[PDB]
Design a binder for this molecule. Structure first.
Ligand SMILES: Nc1ccn([C@@H]2O[C@H](COP(=O)(O)O)[C@@H](O)[C@H]2O)c(=O)n1
Ligand SMILES: Nc1ccn([C@@H]2O[C@H](COP(=O)(O)O)[C@@H](O)[C@H]2O)c(=O)n1
Ligand SMILES: CC(=O)N[C@H]1[C@H]([C@H](O)[C@H](O)CO)OC(C(=O)O)=C[C@@H]1O
Ligand SMILES: CC(=O)N[C@H]1[C@H]([C@H](O)[C@H](O)CO)OC(C(=O)O)=C[C@@H]1O
Ligand SMILES: [Cl-]
Ligand SMILES: [Cl-]
Lengths: 225, 225
């Protein structure tokens, strides 16, 4: 079968952090709508699929002119991985060759231009992932993790907690906005991070993601500049 | 010798991100001044020492009515650990018994009330650290580190990158604001994290730290409410 560049936007309906998160408006347009417009305007995709369990989400997808894949509940639950949804979408439309890009609606400031730029890093021959990421304001080695009840362990070393920032390995946060992969490689590896992975750097600002009403407010302030 | 509760504020002059960072004003008062007022108003300390390599910083300390220790350049360079400075300050004033608290000027929204609350977690008998910390907006396991080669490795597992947030261990960032220790234990362990460590939780908002002009702007917005 022929190579196709698919955009898959996973957008479950019953979001727990904030009700109907993927439909929440930000400057008059839904989170879903922002990512769809970004996919459309990027002009990188032969097909744009929104995958959802919910008719409210499906209905919004249709009004933006894009295809919809209906997910069974097990693939939309709070424990479901993104990979299982994207694979399910690929199986439904019958694509296993070309490129598949995950575009999460939680990243409203990611634009068509970002998608274009990310694509120019993707290499048809080598077929490693392109993943959008931003540098971090606070180094993740300088953290404690809960191990039992009332015990906290350092991420790696106790000494790392007190290391001058610059002595530590450079750290990047994948921001959720863009994950580009060779489709067959995605299917084979069953993950979004495939060697050799290139990072597409976005500003911490443009990497804002929505968990809360505040995040939404703040993204709106950012957009208006 | 008698037990004394020392506050040590390490405040180097030649800050290499943001020029003269520790003297930067935020609502009319320097970062240094904010942490000094917090120490003074907490009423937890017998002595308050500002340790610096620089006369501008020393001068500001004197105007707030607190003691100054002059650090030799080697203890104020970008590679110097905070511990070496605090120990040096303890040796200078001749305290090795009681409690020593590190208060970093980069945490302007940490107040005397925070210090007081942190102190009520400290146990004279058990003598483990109290360290101020806040929960994280983004999980540090979901990160990549530069390994020397050109290539990015996951913090822990590749699978962690795609895990739903809630499946991951709870994460806390020590925020730099408060580190309380038994003085002799600090000296013995030569670090700020001494078992059994208690965490003093602050909001992410109150845990804001200053690396940039924006951080300073943002702290100013926060304070005015
Ligand atoms: N299994 C999953 C996981 C995430 N998602 C969606 O992808 C985005 C990422 O959400 P998280 O940051 O919760 O993974 C959200 O828009 C969320 O609704 C989904 O639709 N199905
Ligand atoms: N050796 C050191 C390390 C940090 N500092 C100060 O401690 C605070 C913490 O800075 P970092 O977060 O960069 O270590 C800053 O105010 C910095 O100027 C210092 O005065 N001497
Ligand atoms: C007590 C301590 O940890 N001091 C360290 C401090 C701290 O880790 C950070 O301020 C946490 O926010 O930061 C840095 C740094 O250059 O980044 C150097 C200090 O040696
Ligand atoms: C591709 C991927 O990793 N998707 C995951 C996503 C991501 O890690 C984060 O949104 C990046 O910022 O988050 C979560 C989550 O419940 O938090 C689950 C998704 O399966
Ligand atoms: Cl969600
Ligand atoms: Cl500094």
């Amino acid at each position: 079968m022929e190579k196709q560049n698919i955009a898959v936007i996973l957008a479950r309906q019953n979001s727990k952090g904030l009700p109907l998160k993927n439909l929440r408006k930000m400057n008059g347009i839904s989170l879903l709508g922002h990512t769809i417009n970004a996919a459309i305007s990027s002009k990188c995709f032969d097909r744009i699929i929104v995958s959802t369990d919910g008719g409210l989400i499906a209905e919004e997808a249709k009004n933006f002119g894009v295809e919809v894949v209906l997910r069974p509940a097990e693939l939309a639950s709070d424990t479901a991985s993104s990979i299982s949804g994207v694979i399910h979408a690929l199986e439904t439309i019958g694509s296993n060759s070309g490129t598949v890009t995950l575009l999460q609606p939680t990243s409203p400031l990611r634009t068509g231009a970002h998608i274009r730029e990310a694509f120019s890093l993707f290499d048809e021959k080598i077929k490693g992932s392109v993943v959008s990421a931003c540098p971090m304001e606070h180094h993740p080695l300088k953290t404690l993790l809960q191990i039992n009840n009332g015990e906290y362990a350092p991420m790696r070393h106790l000494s790392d907690l007190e290391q001058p920032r610059q002595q530590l390995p450079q750290a990047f946060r994948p921001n959720g906005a863009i994950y580009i992969n060779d489709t067959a490689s995605l299917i084979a590896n069953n993950c979004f991070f495939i060697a050799p992975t290139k990072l597409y750097i976005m500003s911490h600002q443009d990497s804002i993601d929505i968990d809360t009403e505040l995040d939404l407010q703040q993204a709106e302030n950012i957009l208006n500049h």
